[PDB]
Design a protein around this nucleic acid. Structure first.
Ligand SMILES: [Mg+2]
Ligand SMILES: [Mg+2]
Ligand SMILES: [Mg+2]
Ligand SMILES: [Mg+2]
Ligand SMILES: [Mg+2]
Ligand SMILES: [Mg+2]
Ligand SMILES: [Mg+2]
Ligand SMILES: [Mg+2]
Ligand SMILES: [Mg+2]
Ligand SMILES: [Mg+2]
Ligand SMILES: [Mg+2]
Ligand SMILES: [Mg+2]
Ligand SMILES: [Mg+2]
Ligand SMILES: [Mg+2]
Ligand SMILES: [Mg+2]
Ligand SMILES: [Mg+2]
Ligand SMILES: [Mg+2]
Ligand SMILES: [Mg+2]
Ligand SMILES: [Mg+2]
Ligand SMILES: [Mg+2]
Ligand SMILES: [Mg+2]
Ligand SMILES: [Mg+2]
Ligand SMILES: [Mg+2]
Ligand SMILES: [Mg+2]
Ligand SMILES: [Mg+2]
Ligand SMILES: [Mg+2]
Ligand SMILES: [Mg+2]
Ligand SMILES: [Mg+2]
Ligand SMILES: [Mg+2]
Ligand SMILES: [Mg+2]
Ligand SMILES: [Mg+2]
Ligand SMILES: [Mg+2]
Ligand SMILES: [Mg+2]
Ligand SMILES: [Mg+2]
Ligand SMILES: [Mg+2]
Ligand SMILES: [Mg+2]
Ligand SMILES: [Mg+2]
Ligand SMILES: [Mg+2]
Ligand SMILES: [Mg+2]
Ligand SMILES: [Mg+2]
Ligand SMILES: [Mg+2]
Ligand SMILES: [Mg+2]
Ligand SMILES: [Mg+2]
Lengths: 169, 211, 122, 296, 159
RNA sequence: GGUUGCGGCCAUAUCUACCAGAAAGCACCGUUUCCCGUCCGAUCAACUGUAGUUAAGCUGGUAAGAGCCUGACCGAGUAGUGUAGUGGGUGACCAUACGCGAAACUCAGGUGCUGCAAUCU
RNA sequence: AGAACAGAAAUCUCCAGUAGAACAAAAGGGUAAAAGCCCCCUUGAUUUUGAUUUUCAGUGUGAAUACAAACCAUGAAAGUG
RNA sequence: CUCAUCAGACACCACAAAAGGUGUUAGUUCAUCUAGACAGCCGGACGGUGGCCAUGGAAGUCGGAAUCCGCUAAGGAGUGU
RNA sequence: AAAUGACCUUGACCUAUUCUCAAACUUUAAAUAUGUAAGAAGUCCUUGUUACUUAAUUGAACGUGGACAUUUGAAUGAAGA
């Protein structure tokens, strides 16, 4: 019974996990920035492994959060890459979904061999209206069962839009 | 090297377990506490005979093991491997210390030396369950195990059904009409409390209000 | 005061005195605390002289205020020196004294058997 | 409720519930302690808070003192009282906050008796100032500003209500660096800007910024402002004349009888379900044991 | 060696009244204290400033001073064969108005009440407390109360 | 009686699953010129009260629901304990006498009460 | 439970989460719009002499508490130091 | 109640244990018995029937599954040769 | 052939059960011990002082005048304190 139980997208966050710091990272970041228009945020390493050749607080990734119409736009610009086909995996039982794409030139943006090529994780987190209870300061509350995103409910929303296909099993 | 058990017969100290603090403890000489057909069903063995302590004393893990093997052996060799369930109801969690003899009695707090169980009066030590066709046999087994222990213990026949807290008539009443539900060693019972749907999937045979 | 007697049960023997026991106690061993100097009673003029304010002016006036626990029992009683009894004459009737009366001893509240004992000690 | 998630008996037995008004995300007790508690040698003289809250577009301004049995309202003024004094639309603007501020300022000053004395600042040039105490006579009424869970940004309307109670006469100790037109870097304040915000200048300037580059959202936003033929040039006097109206009569009269309370009690106990009898649910489960275990 | 610090041995003493941890409710900052009030002393483990030394836990004293955040309490501590006067500066969080006199006060107002009501009619005052007197005669009926005769019971085992 | 702002006691108020909610109020909700804050007007700031909705918040109800609170000659005068004896017993330990007296268990009942101000078919 | 390389371990997201973490250090207390984590502004780790608590002889010392009189820091503020 | 070919004989106290006795004493739970039980001499245990597989060869009996009628006071498809 | 494959297997984890424990574990929680109070230095009223404190003769502390006597506020004891 939806009078407004109408499944918007909350945010899309793009993520290059550039597994070390320096030039390659300050390049993946400008990639995120001429795809986002926003200044992206760098992520420091939590701890230190030395298999993956990293050090605590090493600035070894970058991501960016884009919300609303621009994020529908770059979502579609990536479902093109993945041919509007997804998996019955790839979906949180909590309602969101994501995919990944190496070869970040399949998104539009041209090649420019003084930045290289990069892959990207796409994560689309979804929510109905009145997600504000959970995220506001005063009276912070939890949304009723009936009203929050489901996996099944969001694969149905995803198939219904984009005429896309999800998976086996 | 093991000291004679008379040196630790009595509960002179407060419980000294293995712990963060004591923590160099040697291993208990008794490690298996259920013997025989321990997988059997509560219906399989309605008779129950206890070996019960009549003293406030301490029983060495060494003599616990010694008398476990004593009694289980006699019982199988005259009854069969799966004729009885023998449960020892006493775990020896109390660590005995010893002062290892150019010094004197300066600074003379011992190292761990053994383990031992601290048994009250009337505390069950052994519990054995069979069907009444056996009773003489398990009785004689516990009687032979008695001789492995310091201090008077007495064998007594339970009024209860095997290892249940129910006497035989009350247990019959419960299961004949609606309420017992086997489980691997043991059994579950029908509550009148809690979820009514989740109470019905479980124990469907009942609520005929009949056998 | 009952909690007091509980506190001292193993050192005393006590019970419920009859009129006869109280009368013979005051007559034979009844002494007043008068500006101490405990004083044998020996004439009602002494009682009147000190318990007079309270309406007690005889030895039987005294006894009666004791036995019918009086509006002035506190003063009537604090006026009598503690009675100095001899040992029981018959004996104690038990082989050992420092057990409860109930256990064949002597201490605690025997209840009317206080009268046999005190009469044997007075 | 994923099977992997449900809570144990033990979890709940050993769980310590917070204070109701904290479960309800409504009271910052760490703040309440320090607002309410008084100097112990001041013994019964209560600490008065000027609470101001914001419903979704309506402004509350109470003056409360606290009490072991429950906070007691000395004066109350709601911004929806502004019709009375000559404002009609947007009673959540900065100047509606200032208005309500002033309103309760003078409502309480008169409820007390420092009505004639401590008339506050009248010629409101938007200056920074506090209602000073008067030589040889009663000190002003003192209240502290209870902004609740509001997030103290420079230039926000909680401090507008602040500015208006202050300008009305209440002594409400306050700095200036969160008044609109406080300069981020250089530590000074623009009073022409603060007077503007006191009056409307940012809303009026929005109006005549939209009346000639978007008639297509000016259409709907500001609808009432056209439906009553009043544009930007206006407001500053709507508000100045409300100010007059309030300083002239603060007296709070309330709303007309209108189905007095027992009537409401009835027509809402129509919608208030009352609990079931133990015998009721006894039978309501004996029904279910017949109907479900009973082989249909 | 040994350890005798200021809060030594207070492990449970200062513990937090299980499922009552957290911030202190505001009624204990809303209570008022005047010089000469009788107060109890219980430490609140969550307010480390101004707390009483363990010796004064469970102890009752009299207010002698009133300051901004705290009260001064007078306590009589027994050192040797004599009491000395000790003056603790305790925060309001560790103090509690005492009901050790509530009986007394209620019984002085009750006393003056029935004393007025006494000299109203003829004076029959009767207003000192007296200990429990012993019971008085009574008649017990057997109507529908005939006595069930009990005997002791033989040895069972039950186990 | 509902509701809101501020509350006192801080689960009889919490948790889980459903269902109901008139009026008003809260709410979600629309916008980005201005003050203000962000990687993101999501939060935070401001503007509108206009364009929209009871879906959620919130209120209430249902459940041999979990938890929680209360009560009882339920267990139990049990365990423990103050006091006594030239009591029993090789000892371990034990019974008795004058008092105090639990916890678990079991069963029954209950699921917020209430202060100030304003507002409501 | 979910996202290219990515693997048990890299970075991103949501859900649950009474503290099962963290607060230099030993341990025990204590703490959830904090006492923990990120940020902003600072020097109250300052000045003057008294009283008080523990240890106690009611000496000293160490440590601590609550005020008085200053001058300051922070915050819209109550406050807090 | 106890008879000791090392009896025992009074708190603290000047020691004795596990375990055993068909010495004797009292008691507990099962049983049999004047419809004759226990003990001891005496008779009877036959038969429907060698009921069956091992068959070098088992009426009950080296041995292995097995399990009952007729007569009767009773008499095992078999306790021991 | 592999499978993010079905299947057994032993493992650890989850669920409801089960035997047994703690000086340095605990929701609960005694007994014995332990702090304070049981009036005249009491209770109540009327309304002065101040530089502290209040929005405020508001409060706070200390006072003037007035009303209620030994059932004047439990017990027991007191060769007195
Ligand atoms: Mg709707
Ligand atoms: Mg690498
Ligand atoms: Mg001992
Ligand atoms: Mg020892
Ligand atoms: Mg040695
Ligand atoms: Mg030497
Ligand atoms: Mg040493
Ligand atoms: Mg050592
Ligand atoms: Mg125990
Ligand atoms: Mg033995
Ligand atoms: Mg059990
Ligand atoms: Mg003689
Ligand atoms: Mg004679
Ligand atoms: Mg003798
Ligand atoms: Mg004589
Ligand atoms: Mg459970
Ligand atoms: Mg705050
Ligand atoms: Mg030590
Ligand atoms: Mg908490
Ligand atoms: Mg400190
Ligand atoms: Mg509506
Ligand atoms: Mg906002
Ligand atoms: Mg609904
Ligand atoms: Mg709400
Ligand atoms: Mg509810
Ligand atoms: Mg329930
Ligand atoms: Mg005892
Ligand atoms: Mg003894
Ligand atoms: Mg620590
Ligand atoms: Mg320093
Ligand atoms: Mg010392
Ligand atoms: Mg000295
Ligand atoms: Mg010296
Ligand atoms: Mg010093
Ligand atoms: Mg011999
Ligand atoms: Mg003895
Ligand atoms: Mg023997
Ligand atoms: Mg034959
Ligand atoms: Mg303990
Ligand atoms: Mg005492
Ligand atoms: Mg007295
Ligand atoms: Mg006297
Ligand atoms: Mg004298």
């Amino acid at each position: 019974q939806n009078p407004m139980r109408d499944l918007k997208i909350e945010k899309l966050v793009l993520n290059i996990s550039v597994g070390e710091s320096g030039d390659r990272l300050t390049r993946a970041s400008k990639v995120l920035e001429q795809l986002s228009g926003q200044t992206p945020v760098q992520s420091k390493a939590r701890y230190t492994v030395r298999t993956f050749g990293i050090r605590r607080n090493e600035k070894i990734a970058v991501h960016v959060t884009v919300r609303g119409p621009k994020a529908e736009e770059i979502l579609e610009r990536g479902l093109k890459v993945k041919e509007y086909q997804l998996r019955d995996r790839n979906f949180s039982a909590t309602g969101n979904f994501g995919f990944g794409i190496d070869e970040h030139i399949d998104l539009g943006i041209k090649y420019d061999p003084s930045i290289g090529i990069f892959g990207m994780d796409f994560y689309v987190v979804m929510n109905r209206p009145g997600a504000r209870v959970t995220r506001r300061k005063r009276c912070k509350g939890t949304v009723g069962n009936s009203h929050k995103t489901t996996k099944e409910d969001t694969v149905s929303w995803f198939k219904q839009k984009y005429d896309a296909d999800v998976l086996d099993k | 090297a093991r000291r004679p058990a008379r040196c630790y017969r009595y509960q002179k100290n407060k419980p000294y377990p293995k712990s963060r603090y004591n923590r160099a403890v040697p291993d208990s000489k008794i490690r298996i506490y259920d013997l025989g057909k321990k997988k059997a069903t509560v219906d399989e063995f309605p008779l129950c005979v206890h070996l019960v302590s009549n003293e406030l004393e301490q029983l060495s893990s060494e003599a616990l093991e010694a008398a476990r093997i004593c009694a289980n052996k006699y019982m199988t060799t005259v009854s069969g491997r799966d004729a009885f369930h023998l449960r020892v109801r006493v775990h020896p969690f109390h660590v005995l210390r010893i002062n290892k003899m150019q010094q004197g009695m300066r600074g003379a707090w011992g190292k761990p030396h053994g383990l031992a169980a601290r048994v009250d009066i009337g505390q069950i030590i052994f519990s054995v369950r069979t069907k009444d066709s056996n009773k003489d046999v398990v009785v004689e087994g516990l009687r032979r195990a008695r001789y492995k222990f310091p201090g008077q213990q007495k064998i007594i026949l339970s009024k209860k059904w095997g290892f249940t807290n129910l006497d035989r008539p009350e247990y019959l009443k419960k299961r004949e009409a609606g309420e017992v539900k086997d489980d691997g060693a043991f059994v579950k019972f029908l509550s009148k409390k809690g979820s009514l749907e989740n109470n019905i999937r479980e124990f469907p045979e009942y609520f005929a209000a009949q056998a | 005061t009952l909690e007091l007697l509980k506190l001292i049960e193993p050192y005393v023997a006590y019970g419920y005195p009859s009129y006869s026991t109280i009368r013979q106690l005051v007559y034979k061993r009844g002494f007043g605390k008068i500006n101490k100097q405990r004083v044998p009673l020996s004439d009602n003029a002494i009682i009147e002289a000190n318990l007079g304010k309270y309406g007690i002016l005889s030895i039987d006036d005294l006894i009666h205020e004791i036995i019918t626990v009086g509006p002035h029992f506190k003063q009537a009683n604090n006026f009598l020196w503690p009675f100095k009894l001899s040992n029981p004459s018959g004996g104690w009737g038990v082989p050992r004294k420092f057990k409860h009366f109930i256990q064949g001893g002597s201490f605690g509240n025997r209840e009317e058997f206080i009268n046999k004992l005190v009469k044997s000690m007075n | 409720a994923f099977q992997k998630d449900a809570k144990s008996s033990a979890y709940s037995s050993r769980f310590q519930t917070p204070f109701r008004r904290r479960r309800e995300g409504k009271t910052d007790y760490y703040q309440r302690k320090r607002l309410v508690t008084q100097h112990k040698a001041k013994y019964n003289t209560p600490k008065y808070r000027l609470v101001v809250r914001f419903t979704n577009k309506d402004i509350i301004c109470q003056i409360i003192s606290s009490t072991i049995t429950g906070d007691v309202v000395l004066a109350a003024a709601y911004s929806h009282e502004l019709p009375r004094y000559g404002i009609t639309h947007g009673l959540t603007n900065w100047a509606a906050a200032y208005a309500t501020g002033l309103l309760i300022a003078r409502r309480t000053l008169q409820k007390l008796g420092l009505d004639e004395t401590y008339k506050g600042v009248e010629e409101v040039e938007g200056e920074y100032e506090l209602t000073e105490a008067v030589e040889d006579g009663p000190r002003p009424f003192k209240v502290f500003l209870d902004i609740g869970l509001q997030r103290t940004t420079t230039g926000a309307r909680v401090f507008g209500a602040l500015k208006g109670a202050s300008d009305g006469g209440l002594y409400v100790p306050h700095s200036e660096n969160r008044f609109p037109g406080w300069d981020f870097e250089t530590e000074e304040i623009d009073p022409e800007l603060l007077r503007s915000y006191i009056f409307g200048g940012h809303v009026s300037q929005y109006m005549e910024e939209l009346a000639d580059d978007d008639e297509e959202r000016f259409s709907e936003l500001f609808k009432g402002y056209l439906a009553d033929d009043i544009d930007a040039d206006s407001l500053e006097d709507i508000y100045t004349s409300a100010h007059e109206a309030i300083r002239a009569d603060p007296a709070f009269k309330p709303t007309e009888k209108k189905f007095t309370k027992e009537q409401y009690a009835a027509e809402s106990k129509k919608y208030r379900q009352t609990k079931l009898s133990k015998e009721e649910r006894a039978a309501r489960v004996a029904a279910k044991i017949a109907a479900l275990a009973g082989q249909q | 060696g040994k350890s005798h610090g200021y809060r030594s041995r207070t492990r449970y003493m200062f513990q937090r009244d299980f499922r009552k941890h957290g911030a202190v409710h505001l009624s204990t900052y809303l209570k008022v204290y005047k010089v000469g009030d009788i107060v109890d002393i219980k430490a609140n483990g969550s307010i480390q400033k101004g707390m009483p030394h363990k010796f004064y836990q469970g102890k009752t004293g009299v207010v002698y001073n009133v300051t901004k955040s705290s009260v001064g309490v007078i306590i009589n501590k027994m050192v040797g064969n004599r009491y000395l006067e000790k003056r603790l500066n305790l925060r309001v969080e560790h103090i509690k108005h005492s009901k050790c006199r509530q009986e007394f006060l209620e019984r002085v107002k009750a006393n003056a009440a029935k004393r007025a009501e006494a000299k109203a009619q003829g004076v029959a005052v009767q207003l000192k407390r007296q200990p429990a007197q012993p019971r008085e005669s009574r008649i017990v009926s057997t109507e529908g109360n005939v006595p069930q005769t009990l005997a002791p019971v033989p040895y069972e085992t039950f186990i």
